[PDB]
Amino acid sequence: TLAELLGRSRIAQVANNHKPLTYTGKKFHPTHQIIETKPSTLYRQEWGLKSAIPSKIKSRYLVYNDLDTLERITTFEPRGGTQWNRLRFQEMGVPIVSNIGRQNPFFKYISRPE
RNA sequence: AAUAUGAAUUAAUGCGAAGUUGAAAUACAGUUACCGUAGGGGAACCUGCGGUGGGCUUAUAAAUAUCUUAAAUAUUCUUACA
Ligand SMILES: [K+]
Ligand SMILES: [K+]
Ligand SMILES: [K+]
Ligand SMILES: [Mg+2]
Ligand SMILES: [Mg+2]
Ligand SMILES: [Mg+2]
Ligand SMILES: [Mg+2]
Ligand SMILES: [Mg+2]
Ligand SMILES: [Mg+2]
Ligand SMILES: [Mg+2]
């Protein structure tokens, strides 16, 4: 059915987020999912959102909150810069270690009631 | 006692022409107007108290914005590729 397809659509895959797109507090990790469009689609203002992104946007990365609003605009910011922070961390090749010597969370360890 | 008539006597008002004394109202009408009420004054009107808008909704910024392969690759593409 159409409902089944919609639930699995790429737009459905992005978790609902209404966090401020302009946040001036302390940032410790990414808050919005970066959206990327290919160069061919960018030439046609196609991002896979509800409406065409304004042609003024030359970046290929954005973050958004609402597909449409009462102001008849998309709420988005044309930035994708948290990906470069992650890739620069990867280039520094420093593994993240636990200062408390806890078990690795990414391994299925056999824990006990200690 | 009622009804009708006339009535000394006396009250209110309309229209007509037509000047006079002011300039109260319509614009922020030159003191916002009007409602109720009270007092005062040649005349409109003036003043006090509250009410109404049938006057002020007539309302319109203390400005400041961001990084990924610009192309041998996107931009071309005509039912083709798959
Ligand atoms: K007056
Ligand atoms: K009055
Ligand atoms: K009065
Ligand atoms: Mg006067
Ligand atoms: Mg006058
Ligand atoms: Mg006046
Ligand atoms: Mg007086
Ligand atoms: Mg008054
Ligand atoms: Mg008036
Ligand atoms: Mg008015």
The DSSP bridge pattern shows strands A35-36 and A75-77 to be unpaired
The Cα A44–Cα A54 span in angstroms is 10
- Of the candidates A27, A31, A29, A26, the residue with the CA atom closest to the CA atom of residue A16: A31
Token output for A7: 């639930």
DSSP E strands in A1-114: the ranges are: 35-36, 61-66, 75-77
Resolution in angstrom units: 2.3
Which of A88, A91, A75 minimizes the C-alpha distance to A35?
A75
> Distance between CA A72 and CA A4 in Å, rounded?
28
Distance B1 C1' – A31 CA (angstroms):
107
Question: Residue A2, SS3?
Answer: helix
Q: How far is the CA of A48 from the centre of ligand 7 (A)?
A: 82
Determine contact, residues A58/A81, Cβ cutoff 8 Å: no
Q: Can you state the percent helix, strand and coil of chain A, rounding each to 5?
A: 20, 10, 70
Structure tokens at A81: 């810069």
Question: Is strand B in 7 Å reach of the CB of A79?
Answer: yes
**Residue pair A10/A33 in contact by the 8 Å Cβ criterion:** no
The nucleotide lying nearest A24 (C-alpha to C1') is: B65
Contact call for residues A37 and A29 (beta carbons, < 8 A): no
A79 CB contacts (<8 Å, ≥6 apart)? A59, A61, A62, A63
